[PDB]
Structures are given as structure tokens and as C-alpha cells.
């Protein structure tokens, strides 16, 4: 179902995209996984620990 939903998008099937390095400006070998992950911030911030 994820593969067919990616087929509905204009995206590659394996979920991996060739990416270009920001510093050097050239294609990474072995195309990398990208996507959207839901990420959280915890209240163990650093300006309480210092």
C-alpha cells in the first residue's frame, strides 16, 4: 500500500532519492532515504542542564 501510494505520487518506488551534497555540489553514490518523520522536542533542554 505504501508502494502504490508512492506510485500515486510522482516519487520513486523504493523511497530513495539521489541527493546532491550541499558543500561540494555533486551526487552522492548510493541514493539515500528521505521522507518526512514526525519529530518531537523533549523538555530536557540544554539551558536547564548547564
Amino acid at each position: 500500500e505504501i508502494k502504490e501510494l508512492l506510485k500515486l505520487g510522482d516519487l520513486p518506488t523504493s523511497g530513495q532519492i539521489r541527493l546532491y551534497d550541499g558543500r561540494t555540489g555533486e551526487q552522492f553514490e548510493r541514493p539515500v532515504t528521505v521522507g518526512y518523520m514526525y519529530m518531537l522536542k523533549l523538555n530536557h533542554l540544554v539551558d536547564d542542564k548547564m
Binding site: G22, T24, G25, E26
Partner: protein, 219 residues
């Protein structure tokens, strides 16, 4: 005796963004100028974002103004991307005055002679009462890069972050050209995405101005 690139065509595909073309290029300078111009255009372009909003009846950025459906802070995050162009100044104080039930879009701003809002459909907040009206003073100033609210330097002055960057997304593609019985040349096509406040010729010219200025260090 390398060849030299020139701006051969600026196809304005939309009012927001456009594609310029750098052509011709010797084999190897395509990714050099593509990465370098991408990096300069994302890093350092002169922008015109909002800096310091001063609503009238509002003491601090955490209170609420009576009769607007949004908080003052979501008004700050709506004004943070108020894309505006200025021409002959550096700072300027805009003024928004709007009453009546309905949305308060960017067109409700005083239209002073050089200051031009580039996106009139941009919502700020919604008014909701008959006799209720926000009345703020908006301070737009020029800048460069990203200046957060902490690292700068009465009480009604609410300080927002500065987001001085006209461009948003750069992409470039090298491909071949067919100049005069001579293959293995390169056509750079720089597809930028601008919020609407910098013309692409001005961007692609100021960028090489910055890079060639940086090469003064040893030539």
C-alpha cells in the same frame, strides 16, 4: 582561452519564481558556478523583511487584543513573512488601520510611494466585531541573512525575528549547448524560487558581484 557565459534568457515562468540561463560554459565550470551561485543566492541576498511591529493597545506579545480571533503572537507569525519591496530607503514605518468584520489582508496597509507589498492576498488576522479595529505600526528595514530577536544590540515595541532572504529554493541543471560546430559545452539553467521581492537578473548579478568581490583577496 576559455569561453564566457552570458545571461541568454530569463523566462519568467511565474511572478514568484523564474528560470535564468547561463550559457555557454566550458566542461567543468557548470557545477562550479552552479554550486557557487546556489550557495551565494541562498546565503547572502539583500532582503526587506519586517523587523519591529508596534500594535497600539497591546502591551506585550503574549496578551490578546479584544475582538481579533487570533493571538498577538500568531499575528507576529503572520507578519513575519510579509514580503515587501522597498527601493530608495533602508528603514520605513508602515501603518495598518482596518476596522469592520472580515479578514485583514496585506492590501490594508498604507501604500507609501516606494514601499510596495508584493502579495496582496496575504492574510494577517481576522477581525470579528462591529466596532473593533487593530491599528499597528510596522517597521520594515533592509538586511542580510538571518538576524534573530536575541542577537540585536519604550514597552509597546514588539520585536519579531528578521528573515531577510528573498529566495527560498534554488535548483540548477547543466546540459549541452550547440554554439558553432563545437560540442561538449554546458548550459547552466538556474531555477530559483523567490518570494517575489528580487528580480532574477538582480540576483544573478549581485551574486557574481559578491563572489568576484571575494576573489580580491589574492588577485
Amino acid at each position: 582561452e576559455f569561453l564566457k557565459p552570458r545571461l541568454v534568457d530569463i523566462e519568467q515562468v511565474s511572478s514568484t519564481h523564474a528560470k535564468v540561463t547561463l550559457e555557454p560554459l566550458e566542461r567543468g565550470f557548470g557545477h562550479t558556478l552552479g554550486n557557487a551561485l546556489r550557495r551565494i543566492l541562498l546565503s547572502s541576498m539583500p532582503g526587506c523583511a519586517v523587523t519591529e511591529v508596534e500594535i497600539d493597545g497591546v502591551l506585550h506579545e503574549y496578551s490578546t487584543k479584544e475582538g481579533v480571533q487570533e493571538d498577538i503572537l500568531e499575528i507576529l507569525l503572520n507578519l513575519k513573512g510579509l514580503a515587501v519591496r522597498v527601493q530608495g530607503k533602508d528603514e520605513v514605518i508602515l501603518t495598518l488601520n482596518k476596522s469592520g468584520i472580515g479578514p485583514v489582508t496585506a492590501a490594508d496597509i498604507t501604500h507609501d510611494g516606494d514601499v510596495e507589498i508584493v502579495k496582496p492576498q496575504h492574510v494577517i488576522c481576522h477581525l470579528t466585531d462591529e466596532n473593533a479595529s487593530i491599528s499597528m505600526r510596522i517597521k520594515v528595514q533592509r538586511g542580510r541573512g538571518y538576524v534573530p530577536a536575541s542577537t540585536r544590540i519604550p514597552i509597546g515595541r514588539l520585536l519579531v525575528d528578521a528573515c531577510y532572504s528573498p529566495v527560498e529554493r534554488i535548483a540548477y541543471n547543466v546540459e549541452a549547448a550547440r554554439v558553432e560546430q563545437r560540442t561538449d559545452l554546458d548550459k547552466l539553467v538556474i531555477e530559483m524560487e523567490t518570494n517575489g521581492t528580487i528580480d532574477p537578473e538582480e540576483a544573478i548579478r549581485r551574486a557574481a558581484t559578491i563572489l568576484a568581490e571575494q576573489l580580491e583577496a589574492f588577485v
